[PDB]
């Protein structure tokens, strides 16, 4: 077992050294009103971590359009980072645009409880999705040998933002839920009176007083969430 | 901050009370040479949680074909679980086949660190993926208002099994990685001599001595992984 | 092996989430000049716990006649509480009018020492009777498999209120004590002088200087109390399953 | 606030001094297959406590019939206990048949957590109902100024022994529950499978898969419980004063 | 072993409940400029203890004469105390005029180190003689089976007040010492010069510079002292049985 | 607040140095089947303490007759002890026959809690009465300025031995108790049955079931005890000054 | 081993009971500008300690002339001290003029660490030479069975005072040192420059730059120191 | 303040590095049945410390005559020890024949509590006299600025070996004591009986039972001891400067 930050907490305040200079987290993104996805990797010059980085760079604009910034993390030095980044640019022809935290002593890794049992000395495959108030909203821990599905991270941020602004909860598999489709859920009543008030008016499709929904998302928001999924599902028609 | 089991650790030994009776974890599944996906949810009779159980139920066969069992967990009592399962069968027309742990006191949730700060009481949307050896291979922590993408849980298990059998690492977005498509990665040389022996021959497509791959996964394995994604991406044509 | 509030202590200050919203205890009732009876139960959708609720509900008027409120407590979520109350209303025809604290973790149960060894998980069947100044006057611990006698809880509050207002102690089985029937007890003298003085003036019936009584309770008080007992002893003439 | 034994736990092992002699609890009763009701009272030669002792004594045969022994507990000495009992016999004409633990130092009282905050010194007015295997099945804490209802204690032991031998749970206000009357409840299914297997049946009325009951108690047992309750409700036609 | 107040120390401040009411010690006696003798007893309705109370009661005037009050202590309640006193007054024909501390939980007993190992529960036979400034001047601990010699307690109080007023030390067995009889001792010199200056003139007889005495007590002090002893030595000419 | 050995406890094991040699306590006396009375003093060459030593010496025969040995204790050295004893023998004409413990650092005094607050240094005036099995039966703590009544110590030892052998409790002021005179008390009954069984027979007068006595002490024993008291009561006819 | 005051430290502040009355140390002596020699003894009425008291008594005038006071300490009471002094005066014909501290509990003894491992009871034969500013200058610990050489204590104090006033160190066996006789030593240079600046005369006979001395003591001081020694050496022509 | 070994305790066991090689204390001298005097000094190449070494060296035959070895101790290295020794042999004409402990880190110094508060660093002028059993018999702590009187150290060892063999105590200023001259004291009696048996007949001059003495030393013993003091008193007739 190990110590870790928790969903709902503010990302710990910390200064970090990155590819692009020293930054303070979560301050640096918060103050620009931006969310940030922080993903860690066990080491530079490793194949899975390279495919993940390429996948993220290709999804950079999509993240940016959602108000989201990307920042990576590795136990390696900034010098390795830049060399690794340089290799990716040269051999894959893609420039990684986001910064990468250099954590030579798991100081940061440890502070975030990213040092699991799958291997002493090489950071787990952690993902923190932090919002504009510096709050941890989701954490993903994939294994060292299994690459992330970056399109899901986008779906998550997309649905979360829609949730936050439309004051709704998001069904399983949104926007293709089997029961309500792209519908969004109204938060359940937490008092008898609220349950009665809801059960009667006809405010919105309900299966029961604790299960009501409507379709408030715009056709463009749904369509965007939907293309992420279509992209994850399509066979690539190119390669390298 | 809070204590969690770690990836690579053996799932904590414990006897739990479920919908189907007492079970010892992970023994019960390990003894059958079965992997199990344990997911938790804040509370019975809540809409998102309900959409997820229906999603899991619909994909039960897919898990069974991979030799994967499902087990839920919640802070509610077994009497609520059953009344809840009964309501779902009666109103949605689908019976939930797997058990649900009843953890009225947080004993199980505290033990697994599933009690975050998104809300005292009521568990986080945790997901542990455990292999037939009783080893935790992946942990996902979605937020209370965001339903999981169940098809990604299938991909994870599918690709992991493939990686274990074929002794390969899996690229991001597999099986539709932009760089190598459905190919699987050969674990990187960790010594100079191994690196030389590798950049040295007609073995396997390589971008560098640390980035080599082949396509050892069968057509059916790949297609299976690909239909989960197509499912996730397809707009439902019925709506229960 | 346990630890819990004590009689005479003030009910621990706390904010609880219920069926009806968040509530501060004991403030919510003290501020209204009301006593309250808090009772816990291991779980929603259980037989015995359902019969107790219906019983308390049938007796609701009797408690509010006494200026007493009712509040339940279970380890379940407010969502279960609500479906369970909906199931009772719908299949038994009685609406539970009082709030039920949802204690999903055991925070409230643990804080009240309501977590016994009859079962890890699930609160024991605890009952706390609390007066209008927020002081615990009586606590009852019935077992998981044995429903409570709601009429006795009414007799206790009624008798405690009488004892308080008339400054008297209440004999066993009142108002049908075998020695003094409905008589109420004068607090025993605590000094020799007081004892000498009490005897000396047939002011009121005495068996000895430490045992004196009179009958200051109104006929209404007395028989309202005998009525709770009458009701408990009566075989029902209807039966709701029916 | 304080530490106390809990329902479900075995009664603390201990040797106590009573006005009948030294007794080991819960052993002395366990070994006879007897349940025991231990009740504490703050002090000898006090009004309320005397009316309770007389009430228990008059009902002594009813407890004995159920195989339940009685044992009191007070902070006073055995000498006081004996003089007190002597007074009760002489002035009220009733002999207290059960022993009384003498606890000059709330050792026992503290051990049972019976030292509340209603008063430093002078034990709480607590009652523990322990079964024949030495397990605490019920605990009642009545205030110092309020005598207990001994017939409710009889009801508890009767219903509990019934629930035990018939493997049933007892409804509120049994045997006069408003919903199922003298009916006893079948313990709810704890697995999806038991719930489904639970259908109407003959004898086994059900309001739901978790609410099933039958009427297995003999007419004598129902009558016996019912009379404790009638007795508690009836005004005595003869006051011992 | 156990902790106890010490000779020379102020009697522990504390509020106690007695069968005459709540009292603060030693304040309640200090503020009256009265000495008090506090004696403890293991239990009410015990024989040795009853003979001591009567002996103390019969000698009450002698204590008043000295400006000394009496106060007993027992683990029992105020109710048992009053009943016990009633029994003594009714069966022995003597009323106990002084209060008795009721210490249901050895709260008081423990605070005074009165809980020895002669028996868990039931306080030891301790006696505290306390002067009008609240200072512990003497402590006595008799066994549970041995009645005190109340006349020696009177002798101690008398001699102590005498020693105090006259600035003198009291010889063994005073006022019947075999060396100097009713003589009272002059505190010995603590320095060489005081010792050299000390010479037996006029009123001082000296066996050495450290052993000097005179006879400053009044004949009334000496005879009252002697009377307590005569009384103790005299075989009663009646017997209250 | 200080730390004492308690009545009922075995006298602490310890090796001490006395002016007769090194001795182990209580072993030395217990091994001879003897009782001992250990009395402490604040210092050699002090008046009160000298009168006490002389009083004890004159009563040495009486202690021996009871199978009791004496042992004193002071904070001074063996050299002072011996010089002091020599001074007593030469100036008063009496040789002190019992040993005195030399406790130059208070080691023994602290071990026995004899270091009170009546003065740092210089031991209190304590007395321990220990029986032949090494158990402390009585403890007396007299002030620096008040000499003890040695005859009362003899009375306590006599009475206790009678009590032990005849299995009886001793009344206040025995053998001149005002209620039963030289009678010895039968230990009270501790159970109801035992109390009913009690009987006022011919050799067991009773005032109540808890208060019975008889007169099993031989005339000699009673006589021996009455003369300790008479001796304390009598004005010496020849003062040693 | 044991706690203990140390040379150079201030004599511990404390009030003591003596057979002349209560005294505060070192204050009582410091305030009169006097030095004091405090000697402890194991017991009153012991032969060796008595020969010592007589010895000190005879040399009382000598200590007075040096501005030094004497004070004894023993574990016994003031009453023993006085009987003991009375016995010496009467049997030996000499009155002990100084006070003796009465230490019934080893309060003082323990405080001065005078309770060695030769008799847990009864104080060691300790001597503290204290100067006028309350500072311990010497500590002698003789055995229980060996009487002290009181003239040596006179030498030490005489030497020490000379050394203080003339700012010099005292050679072994002064004033009869075999190398420099009555010469007193000039404090050694502690730096290279001081050592050079120090030469031949330029102020004082030298055997090396770290060993220089002169003869600054008057003939009376030297003769006084030497008479202490002759007295120590002569066989008494009387015997008391 | 600080911790030191104490008279009567065994000299701490320890291996030390010296001028002459590694040696274990006190075994190295004990195993030869030799006593040893260990003196420490703050620093090599210092004036006072040099006059002392020379003085010890000059008296070396006198120490050997008595079976006593010498060993020094300083904070400096063995290299400085030998260089210093070499300088003394070359400039003063005298070779130091005994070893010197080299204690570069106050290890030995701290172990012997020789690290006093006149100077952090640089050990005090301490002297330990140890008998052939490795027991500490005397400790002397002279100030940094004052050299020792080596002849007094010889007197101590002479007198101490004398006392030990003849079982006598040595009076002040022996062998020139003002009261008994060269007489040696008989250890005082520690019990009344030994004291009574002690008497001054023929040999035994006694001033009291606690002060007896004889003259058991040989004329040689007495005169050698007197010689040490005589040398200390004689103005040298040569001076090595």
Curated annotation (Swiss-Prot), chains D, E, F, H:
Catalytic activity, as annotated: a hydroperoxide + [thioredoxin]-dithiol = an alcohol + [thioredoxin]-disulfide + H2O
Record keywords: Antioxidant, Cytoplasm, Disulfide bond, Oxidoreductase, Peroxidase, Redox-active center
Entry superkingdom: Archaea
EC number(s) per entry: 1.11.1.24
Signal peptide: none
Protein name: Peroxiredoxin
Taxonomic placement: Archaea, Thermoproteota, Thermoprotei, Desulfurococcales, Desulfurococcaceae
Disulfide bonds: 206-212
InterPro entries associated with the record: AhpC/TSA, Peroxiredoxin, Peroxiredoxin_AhpC-typ, Peroxiredoxin_C, Peroxiredoxin_TDXH, PRX_1cys, Thioredoxin-like_sf, Thioredoxin_domain
Phenotype when changing residue 49 to S: Abolishes enzyme activity
Biological processes annotated in GO: cell redox homeostasis; cellular response to hydrogen peroxide; hydrogen peroxide catabolic process
SUPFAM superfamilies hit by this protein: Thioredoxin-like
Places the protein is found: Cytoplasm
Primary location recorded for the protein, binned into one broad class: cytoplasm
Pfam families named in the record: 1-cysPrx_C, AhpC-TSA
Effect ascribed to mutating residue 206 to S: Reduces enzyme activity
Assembly: Homodecamer. Pentamer of dimers that assemble into a ring structure.
């Amino acid at each position: 077992p190990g110590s870790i930050p928790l969903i709902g907490e503010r990302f710990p305040e910390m200064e970090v050294t990155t590819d692009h200079g020293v930054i303070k987290l979560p301050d640096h993104y918060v103050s620009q009103g931006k969310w940030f996805v922080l993903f860690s990797h066990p080491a530079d010059f490793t194949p899975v971590c390279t495919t993940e980085f390429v996948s993220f760079a290709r999804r950079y604009e999509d993240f940016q359009r959602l108000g989201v910034d990307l920042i990576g993390l590795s136990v390696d030095s900034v010098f390795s980072h830049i060399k690794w980044k340089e290799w990716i640019e040269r051999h894959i022809g893609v420039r990684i645009p986001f910064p990468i935290i250099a954590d030579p002593q798991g100081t940061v890794a440890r502070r975030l409880g990213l040092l699991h049992a799958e291997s002493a000395t090489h950071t787990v495959r952690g993902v923190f999705i932090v919002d504009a108030r510096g709050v941890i909203r989701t954490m993903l821990y994939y294994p060292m040998e299994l690459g992330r599905l970056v399109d899901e991270i986008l779906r998550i941020v997309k649905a979360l933002k829609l949730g936050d602004s439309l004051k709704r909860a998001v069904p399983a598999d949104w926007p293709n839920n089997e029961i309500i489709g792209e519908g969004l859920i109204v938060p359940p009543p937490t008092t008898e009176d609220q349950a009665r008030a809801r059960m009667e008016s006809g405010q919105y499709r309900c299966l029961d007083w604790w299960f009501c929904w409507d379709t408030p998302a715009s056709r463009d928001d749904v369509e965007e969430a939907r293309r992420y999924l279509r992209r994850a599902a399509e066979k690539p028609a190119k390669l390298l």
